Design an enzyme around this catalytic site. Sequence first.
Site, PDB file in Angstrom:
ATOM      1  N   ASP A  62      -0.068  14.964 -13.108  1.00  0.00           N
ATOM      2  CA  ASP A  62      -0.859  14.250 -12.134  1.00  0.00           C
ATOM      3  C   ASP A  62      -1.685  15.290 -11.439  1.00  0.00           C
ATOM      4  O   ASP A  62      -1.153  16.327 -11.046  1.00  0.00           O
ATOM      5  CB  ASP A  62       0.056  13.515 -11.169  1.00  0.00           C
ATOM      6  CG  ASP A  62      -0.701  12.679 -10.143  1.00  0.00           C
ATOM      7  OD1 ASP A  62      -1.947  12.835  -9.947  1.00  0.00           O
ATOM      8  OD2 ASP A  62      -0.027  11.839  -9.478  1.00  0.00           O
ATOM      9  N   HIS A  71      -0.118  10.065 -13.275  1.00  0.00           N
ATOM     10  CA  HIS A  71      -0.244   9.498 -11.939  1.00  0.00           C
ATOM     11  C   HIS A  71       0.226   8.059 -11.858  1.00  0.00           C
ATOM     12  O   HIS A  71      -0.149   7.223 -12.689  1.00  0.00           O
ATOM     13  CB  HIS A  71      -1.700   9.581 -11.488  1.00  0.00           C
ATOM     14  CG  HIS A  71      -1.966   8.967 -10.161  1.00  0.00           C
ATOM     15  ND1 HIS A  71      -1.611   9.558  -8.967  1.00  0.00           N
ATOM     16  CD2 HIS A  71      -2.571   7.807  -9.838  1.00  0.00           C
ATOM     17  CE1 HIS A  71      -2.003   8.793  -7.963  1.00  0.00           C
ATOM     18  NE2 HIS A  71      -2.580   7.720  -8.465  1.00  0.00           N
ATOM     19  N   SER A  77      -0.317   6.636  -4.002  1.00  0.00           N
ATOM     20  CA  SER A  77      -1.671   7.183  -4.244  1.00  0.00           C
ATOM     21  C   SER A  77      -2.565   7.187  -2.968  1.00  0.00           C
ATOM     22  O   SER A  77      -2.313   7.980  -2.051  1.00  0.00           O
ATOM     23  CB  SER A  77      -2.337   6.453  -5.437  1.00  0.00           C
ATOM     24  OG  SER A  77      -3.640   6.925  -5.632  1.00  0.00           O
TER      25      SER A  77
END
Lengths: 306, 306, 301, 305
Positions: free
Chosen positions: D251, D281, D156
């Site tokens: 995502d 995600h 991320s």
Amino acid sequence: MPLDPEVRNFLQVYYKANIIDFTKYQFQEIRQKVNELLAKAVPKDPVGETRDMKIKLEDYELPIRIYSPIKRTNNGLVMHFHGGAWILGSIETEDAISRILSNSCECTVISVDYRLAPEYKFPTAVYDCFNAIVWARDNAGELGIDKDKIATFGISAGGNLVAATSLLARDNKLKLTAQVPVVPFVYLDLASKSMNRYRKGYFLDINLPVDYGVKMYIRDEKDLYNPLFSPLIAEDLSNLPQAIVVTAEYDPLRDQGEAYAYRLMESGVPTLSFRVNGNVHAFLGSPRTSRQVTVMIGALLKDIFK
Amino acid sequence: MPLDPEVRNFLQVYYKANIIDFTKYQFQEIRQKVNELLAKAVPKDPVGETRDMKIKLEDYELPIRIYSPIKRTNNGLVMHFHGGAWILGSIETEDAISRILSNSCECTVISVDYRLAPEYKFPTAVYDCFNAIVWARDNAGELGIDKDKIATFGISAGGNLVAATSLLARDNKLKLTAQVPVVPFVYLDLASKSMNRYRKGYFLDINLPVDYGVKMYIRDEKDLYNPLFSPLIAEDLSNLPQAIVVTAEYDPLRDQGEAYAYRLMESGVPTLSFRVNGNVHAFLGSPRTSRQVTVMIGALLKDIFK
Amino acid sequence: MPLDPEVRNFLQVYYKANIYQFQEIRQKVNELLAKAVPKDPVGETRDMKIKLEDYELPIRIYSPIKRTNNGLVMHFHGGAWILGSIETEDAISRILSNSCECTVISVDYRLAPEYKFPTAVYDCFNAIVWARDNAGELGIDKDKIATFGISAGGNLVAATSLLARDNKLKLTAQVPVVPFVYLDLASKSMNRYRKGYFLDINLPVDYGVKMYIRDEKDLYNPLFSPLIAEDLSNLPQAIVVTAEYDPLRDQGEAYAYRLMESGVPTLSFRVNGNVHAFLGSPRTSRQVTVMIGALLKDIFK
Amino acid sequence: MPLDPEVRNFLQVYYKANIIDFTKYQFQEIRQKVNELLAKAVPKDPVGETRDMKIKLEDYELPIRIYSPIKRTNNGLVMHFHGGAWILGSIETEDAISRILSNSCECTVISVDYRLAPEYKFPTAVYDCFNAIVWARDNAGELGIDKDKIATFGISAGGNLVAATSLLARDNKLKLTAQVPVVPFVYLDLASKSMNRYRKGYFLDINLPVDYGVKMYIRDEKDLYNPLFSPLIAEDLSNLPQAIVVTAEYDPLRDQGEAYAYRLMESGVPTLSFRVNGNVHAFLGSPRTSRQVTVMIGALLKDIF
């Protein structure tokens, strides 16, 4: 399109080569010429041992090859069914895959030479592969494997045979620990985006509504909705083995494979499903990707065999 | 789910209402409950004239409504087949669409009350619609229309019938100048993204592999590969009328409709294909969008009838 | 690949043709764009110039064969902010005017690299202000003014709507066709169709952008990239049109989604089997223009 | 949507919980609320050994954790940068991932506690992560690792930092054998389908045009086109390390990550790029999937090492 450059270069050479044409060559020579292409695609890693033999069926002697890994650390077993659109391919054509798979799994792998169309039509291939699983389970002690650690693996038509086998396995209450259909055929898909966009100019060339490979494999149009041919049309996809479904982005069969994996998830079956980007069907033109996928799968199977 | 805000609100109210509930309603009651919802969806624009009558068929008297536009500027004709999954809907439910279409086309529109399932199974609806086209052509002089300017139009199951009737039209050398399937059903699509993502929660709720509405319409599983039921499965889609295929972005039937349109293009048929974004099946919850699409369609037909 | 066969053939020919200093490339392309669609007859055509503080801005006023309403459509041509003219999109203006059944005014805004951003945007906005101020002489209703534009023209439609809102100028509708609205590097459409489908684009910043903008800080300016605007509410009713195999497809659809979420009534459709601006398919180009006209006509009714 | 059922259930629980609510909670409380949620997401596998220490920088002491695998079969090193939108997360939040990664790689893993926004703005985190890599290279003998076998890994915002540090590594001629951005942020993407379809209701809730997390991390708008913040805007993405980019189907960052991967392929960088289907995600709500992805990643790095 945005492919891997090595794959793009492969496609240029492949179409310039003009292997598949019935103007010049007969079917048997096309079968052989494609088999030679597939067999040279990935380099062969060394393994512990290789043994060819034949399983005795009532009407046929089914050839198999048993692979023993360099290092054996579990008592699992992986049944490997090759691809080739039900009409070509063999143990030799996916030999390099079996070797990498065996070493990554650190377990025994058995590759099957099931009978092919047009000589032997559906459902012969499905039953040949299923009888080979039953044979392996019956000889589990001889092979040094656990009966509850048998997995199936297959690419393309091989992936079809993995899905079809799982349905027979469930009917007959034969337990499989896992199934690994890679870029499988599971349905006569006419509607998806992947099918319509990449059905031409990405190695796996498919005509619509019914392509050449399916016409050669099936007996008639009634087989199209048979779940052993098209497992996606099955009423029930629950109580099937834990699945690892792998697709490719620029593969016409991409969307049906991802559909099959969702159907399993919805039916309660624990499933991993991933899509390899920048690659065409079966990761052709990229031996690096082909290797990496096989190694990833092996690591997951090895983890299930713990 | 980035929908049009009016559409999003409609879905909240639609599901809270709980219309399709077989525990507390019989099928006939559900048919009427849905018909009232569809009939009130778009407001009625004024037209020139409206005439109800019945066509005499061999086994039935087929009700039609003939619409004359407020201003009649050509001698075109548009045959209108309503939607409703083969089991509900009528001339009344899509009356407002017929009125807008007639005024936009500036030509005559004839809407057909074909027989429905489960009372009459496939292929009754398809033949009722085709025989209505033949009646219109035979009575061209009485209706004041050009035999070379007959088009067909339909929404959802109506869009199915438009595709199916064009195949019969071709078979029987019945000349049609255009076809306008809106959000059509053309195939038993199990593999597309649109089907798997939007088959629940977006009004048109579909179960896999075979939905309730299909089961009511078809006689048995052999009909699934029948081209008159699934026109996408047809071996030949050439020499069919010029097509305007419309889909919606959050419609499970979106991908098969776009696939139909592409197959027509490849077969040589001049085709416009557009997808309406931010909308669900049949533009429900958005009367503005429903109107605008119909006006666009009428302007294109008018240009063909020029 | 799965395109309309006429479009596919056009692309084969286009790349084999291999279509020089910049000013001459402009003229070569303008001649090719002007012969692309055949010209329908209209009611009348009048050339004139709007007097701005530093420039006399040429316009062409088209009157339809049949005039049935007092609406007005402002047409801003495309050409990547660097080429194109009234002449290059003359055939579109004619079809649009006949379909709308109302007056259409085409604008020759100043182009880069001679005049950089934000000149084009202000030339188009001042043309709108002129038309609104001179509504009575033109015989149009002040409350029935729409804007229309293709590609860079679509950008200008979006940009002028923001200025229209800032300055409290009412527009009844906006029609960006295949617009540029953002420096999109991440979408599927951009990455898949930026080479081989006519509109060839380099990443991260394309040639046409580099010529139009003054420096990198313009990239997040809302008048250049309206998609990066904080507020997209209180803008005119929108008809956004995209093409399936266009690298700008996703940004245009995104703009339309952002409008809908902001409360603006929006129609957004994607034309399938076609490339940017419907090149290689004059039939499709005509049909889209006819459809748009029928919708505008309905808003002007 | 057709999510994994376990993930769908996680989302129902997550939104009913109402963790991120600035009416009720202060920012520090929300930080720790989300950290707790991330830390307990995956079960901790046992490893060989764990050691905490601090790298001494000019202006700061950078905390790190060294993981030794159950079985150590190579002298590779994987630098692990945690996620959390530049404003939260720690070595603790991604500890379970470090463990699984170390075991699967069969090599040493070092997690870094880089400084976070809003206390330290961009480009602090990027430099903290880069200096950790430099430290590891300088102390390669002490750590028993080969200088030519250093990889980076991140999820991320961690994935952002992996891409950013590979650009700095190139600038400074520092060799990395591989880079593994998982579900990375690489661009201010407003145009893509994934962003517009899945930015609300799939855990990672993002406002447009500029999200809360970006506003806190960035100094001013000029940073939006900085390649250290948005590596996808880099003029040149060649001569970067061999990449494994991983994305998730539902995502909002999916498309930008796949775009980064394609740009690397075009630039001649050998890359594997795959998308995990039926997942949101970071594979939240599916610890089984999160584990399997990390195992696959480790198997690939092991093969490189």
